[PDB]
Design a protein around this motif. Structure first.
Motif, mmCIF file in Angstrom:
data_model
loop_
_atom_site.group_PDB
_atom_site.id
_atom_site.type_symbol
_atom_site.label_atom_id
_atom_site.label_comp_id
_atom_site.label_asym_id
_atom_site.label_seq_id
_atom_site.Cartn_x
_atom_site.Cartn_y
_atom_site.Cartn_z
ATOM 1 N N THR A 84 41.835 55.262 42.729
ATOM 2 C CA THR A 84 40.650 54.791 42.023
ATOM 3 C C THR A 84 39.380 55.373 42.629
ATOM 4 N N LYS A 119 41.432 43.226 31.518
ATOM 5 C CA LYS A 119 41.142 43.850 30.236
ATOM 6 C C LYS A 119 39.692 43.670 29.812
ATOM 7 N N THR A 120 38.868 43.020 30.630
ATOM 8 C CA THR A 120 37.499 42.690 30.268
ATOM 9 C C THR A 120 36.533 43.262 31.294
ATOM 10 N N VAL A 121 35.522 43.980 30.817
ATOM 11 C CA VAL A 121 34.493 44.520 31.698
ATOM 12 C C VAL A 121 33.490 43.412 31.982
ATOM 13 N N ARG A 142 46.757 53.009 45.453
ATOM 14 C CA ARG A 142 45.990 52.676 44.258
ATOM 15 C C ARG A 142 44.493 52.737 44.524
ATOM 16 N N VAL A 167 34.328 50.776 33.493
ATOM 17 C CA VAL A 167 35.701 50.724 33.006
ATOM 18 C C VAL A 167 36.684 51.028 34.126
ATOM 19 N N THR A 168 36.389 52.028 34.963
ATOM 20 C CA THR A 168 37.264 52.313 36.098
ATOM 21 C C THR A 168 37.422 51.090 36.994
ATOM 22 N N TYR A 169 36.298 50.488 37.379
ATOM 23 C CA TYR A 169 36.323 49.292 38.210
ATOM 24 C C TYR A 169 37.107 48.168 37.547
ATOM 25 N N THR A 170 37.101 48.115 36.213
ATOM 26 C CA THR A 170 37.859 47.081 35.512
ATOM 27 C C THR A 170 39.350 47.400 35.493
ATOM 28 N N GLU A 171 39.693 48.677 35.323
ATOM 29 C CA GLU A 171 41.092 49.086 35.315
ATOM 30 C C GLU A 171 41.740 48.801 36.658
ATOM 31 N N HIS A 172 41.020 49.073 37.748
ATOM 32 C CA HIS A 172 41.584 48.852 39.075
ATOM 33 C C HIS A 172 41.916 47.383 39.305
ATOM 34 N N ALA A 173 41.090 46.482 38.789
ATOM 35 C CA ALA A 173 41.298 45.049 38.951
ATOM 36 C C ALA A 173 42.342 44.476 38.001
ATOM 37 N N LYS A 174 42.996 45.309 37.191
ATOM 38 C CA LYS A 174 44.038 44.937 36.236
ATOM 39 C C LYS A 174 43.504 44.138 35.055
ATOM 40 N N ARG A 187 39.039 58.884 41.432
ATOM 41 C CA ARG A 187 38.514 58.905 40.070
ATOM 42 C C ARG A 187 37.014 58.626 40.038
ATOM 43 N N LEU A 188 36.552 57.667 40.841
ATOM 44 C CA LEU A 188 35.128 57.327 40.874
ATOM 45 C C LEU A 188 34.267 58.464 41.410
ATOM 46 N N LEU A 202 38.998 46.941 24.698
ATOM 47 C CA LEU A 202 38.242 46.470 25.849
ATOM 48 C C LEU A 202 37.298 45.360 25.420
ATOM 49 N N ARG A 203 37.348 44.232 26.117
ATOM 50 C CA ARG A 203 36.373 43.176 25.917
ATOM 51 C C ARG A 203 35.260 43.268 26.953
ATOM 52 N N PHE A 204 34.102 42.707 26.607
ATOM 53 C CA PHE A 204 32.928 42.726 27.468
ATOM 54 C C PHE A 204 32.371 41.322 27.632
ATOM 55 N N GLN A 205 32.018 40.956 28.860
ATOM 56 C CA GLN A 205 31.146 39.805 29.039
ATOM 57 C C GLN A 205 29.795 40.092 28.402
ATOM 58 N N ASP A 210 32.399 54.455 34.866
ATOM 59 C CA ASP A 210 32.613 53.817 36.161
ATOM 60 C C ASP A 210 32.934 52.341 36.003
ATOM 61 N N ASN A 235 37.859 43.409 45.389
ATOM 62 C CA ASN A 235 38.957 42.632 44.844
ATOM 63 C C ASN A 235 39.454 41.570 45.812
#
Lengths: 97, 93, 105, 83, 97, 78, 105, 95
Positions: free
Chosen positions: H66, D60-62, H62, D51-58, H69-70, A45-48, D49, H54
């Motif tokens: 999500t 790889k970066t938070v 989906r 990370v979840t929000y990042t996974e949903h958006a496809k 899960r939240l 995982l990358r982070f801003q 949370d 989004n």
DNA sequence: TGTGTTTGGGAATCCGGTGCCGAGGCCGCTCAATTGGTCGTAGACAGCTCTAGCACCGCTTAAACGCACGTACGCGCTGTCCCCCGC
DNA sequence: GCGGGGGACAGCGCGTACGTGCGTTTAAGCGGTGCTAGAGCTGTCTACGACCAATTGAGCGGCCTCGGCACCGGATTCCCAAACACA
């Protein structure tokens, strides 16, 4: 020589930090901690940078508020030293788990 | 890509209030966030009121009721006064 | 063509607030006076906070408002504090406050 | 590299500084570990949370916006980082 | 015969935590709600279920507040709850400024 | 009229909270807090009623007024 | 003609959930599997609570579930307790709990 | 005579599945109806937020997954996702 | 001065009868879910660019760490006085 | 309203743990370099969901029945509060 009484420098530090706004946790160890925590949810995982900054701001605000409530609890118990039981009581009353 | 902000309006309001004071970029970011947050609070509450009165439009009345619900006492009084003043002036002209 | 904000004597964009209400799925239909009322309320709250923050900045011999000043303005005004109670402000700090018990006799 | 046992990076002086900002005059010795626990929990709740929000958006970066949204989802809204 | 002090307090604690009925008299609470509402709008009418809902919410709130107050009192190494305990619990909860 | 919340009623409410011993000054505090709470709920409820053109405060109005403060209440038509 | 709930092997009304989603202004468009997934989640949660509440009712030699049993079921299950933490249940009561300090020696 | 909507019959069916020799009082049915409506609104609102966040115009399974899960705690979210994915799998596999 | 155990006695609990009202089932109806079909477009996919996140290195110095030393605060103990509790 | 007993609060002692200060060590912070994974944007085309008319059965209102639960009284049991024997 010269040595200040216990608690004078504590008040001096209280005034200095309650007067300033700069972040009180070292940035690099906090970034490492955040990354290693998130490693448990998804690998690679990358982070801003601003994301870690927001996380640090939020964490410091949370901990400062928690320490305010702990100090209130401790004073309520006719003490001046904050103790872990004060933290536990403050989080119990606040509703956290 | 275009970006949305309330920067210029906040700056105009500040100049209307304190004509010789500037504002940081960080403070403008915070003021933008605050304006957004309050906007969503009011609009969500008004939408709630409308759907739970089986009512289909959002009128100024819904906004006014949402303001009474969201804002504390004196702030709600003055905000309602300003909103009524603005609606009256807008409809008169 | 004169804008809706000018006709209502406001500085916030009435047309833009109306657009956001329409494109926010709050309701199927939006009355004419709803964006005007909302813009007036938003402008009033922004004006109040900028008042208080400018006063706080002048209290510190500062001619610019920084998040610290906004925090002092919010936390010192009780109804604003109630409104923005669950809100944390980046680079805001806290109010100077020491319990009277901790001060020496 | 693997990241391991970075909770000790929250040093005793940093915790003392945070307590000073909170108006605390005397700190017990067992506070520091308790704090490192509390903080670690808070972080886990926020990051999960985000990370979840990042996974949903496809992605790889938070992003910072995910963190802001997770925070406001916990009723702890944050000003100054967009949104 | 007499019971030892504090024993009946515990018996009533168990008795009231075992049950579920309302602990406030219905008619004084109804009068109080109507009196309070008179200050906001005049000549209002209340369905009985509305007053029932208000009573249930208020009783739940007060029971939770007394739970926090009890926690505060135990923290100060007391057994008696005092107004300072209520104020501290409400302040930490975020209700009292 | 706040006095309708008698001393034994507050005593019972505290007992449900697990409180063993209650000071004598608790009651006037409790009355104060409760009154404040009621004003904060009823205000919103009445606001919903007046917005609805009605003159009768319905249990649904109270349910939404409670959900307003994050005090969600189950069992009254919510 | 077989109902959408039957085709998905559920007992909660998929069609009704779909109607509520459309007539609730959550979004402009609703996927086909969204009501099915949502109905499955509600059915699972209801099944969990009815499990726990039935157990609690049987613990009191009662064959019917009353609000007290639902309240005990929620407050005794930690993930349900987290979910329904800010929720008060009419006629629910509280968990039997006395601080260990208050008990006599 | 108005139109009333509730989940009494479906809750009763689920109860008969879980505890066949067990009934439910009307007050408890009202509470369960309130719970179901509350959870529906929470999940639907979170899904609507996710769809908007989004810049997306449709609520798909989906988004529901999500949002589940939240909102739900870990173990509960895991089981809920298993059940929902199983249900959608069965629904699309058949036709 | 102290305390293990006794024992009559109120208070919570169990058990059987009973009766009563709401929960569960059945019927008639209707309106909302289902089917089939048309059509528009939301988004899934490919593909392309460029930025900003990651890894590394070196240097300086400020902060963290360990340790000595002292005192002041927490905690235990005693006493009393009074204000909640039980009735 | 009243008797009284336990708890809140005051005072004291002590001892160790926390604050202050000093010297040493460490790694944070800053700058500077380089690489590439992935975020963000664009074009297509296609499957998927909205809309509509017709069908119908699932669900909702209304009635009816009986059994689960509330209630009452009587017997069972279970904590209780000092008093006694005995240390």
């Amino acid at each position: 020589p010269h040595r200040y009484r216990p608690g004078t420098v504590a008040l001096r530090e209280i005034r200095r930090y309650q007067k300033s706004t700069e972040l009180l946790i070292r940035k690099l160890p906090f970034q490492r901690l955040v990354r290693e925590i998130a490693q448990d949810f998804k690998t690679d995982l990358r982070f801003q940078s601003s994301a870690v900054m927001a996380l640090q701001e939020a964490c410091e605000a949370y901990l400062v508020g928690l320490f305010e409530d702990t100090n209130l609890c401790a004073i309520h118990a006719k003490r001046v030293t904050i103790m872990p039981k004060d933290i536990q009581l403050a989080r119990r009353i606040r509703g956290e788990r | 890509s275009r970006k949305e902000s309330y920067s210029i309006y906040v700056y105009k309001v500040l100049k209307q209030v304190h004509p010789d004071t500037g504002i940081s970029s960080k403070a403008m970011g915070i003021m933008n966030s605050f304006v957004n947050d309050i906007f969503e609070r009011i609009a969500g509450e008004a939408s709630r009121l409308a759907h739970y009165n089986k009512r289909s439009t959002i009128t100024s009345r819904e906004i006014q009721t949402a303001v009474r619900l969201l804002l504390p006492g004196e702030l709600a009084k003055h905000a309602v006064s300003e909103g009524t003043k603005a609606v009256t002036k807008y409809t008169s002209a | 063509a004169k804008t809706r904000s000018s006709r209502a004597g406001l500085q916030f964009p009435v047309g833009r607030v109306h657009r956001l209400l329409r494109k926010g799925n709050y309701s199927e239909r939006v009355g004419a006076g709803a964006p005007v009322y909302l813009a007036a309320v938003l402008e009033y709250l922004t004006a109040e906070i900028l008042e208080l923050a400018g006063n706080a900045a002048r209290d510190n011999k500062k001619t610019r408002i920084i998040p610290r000043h906004l925090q002092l303005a919010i936390r010192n005004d009780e109804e604003l504090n109630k409104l923005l109670g669950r809100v944390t402000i980046a680079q805001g700090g806290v109010l100077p406050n020491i319990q009277a018990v901790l001060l020496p006799k | 590299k693997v990241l391991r046992d970075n909770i000790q990076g929250i040093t005793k002086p940093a915790i003392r500084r945070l307590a000073r900002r909170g108006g605390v005059k005397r700190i017990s010795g067992l506070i520091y570990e308790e704090t490192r626990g509390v903080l670690k929990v808070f972080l886990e709740n926020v990051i999960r949370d985000a990370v979840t929000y990042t996974e949903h958006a496809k992605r790889k970066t938070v992003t910072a916006m995910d963190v802001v949204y997770a925070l406001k989802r916990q009723g702890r809204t944050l000003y100054g980082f967009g949104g």
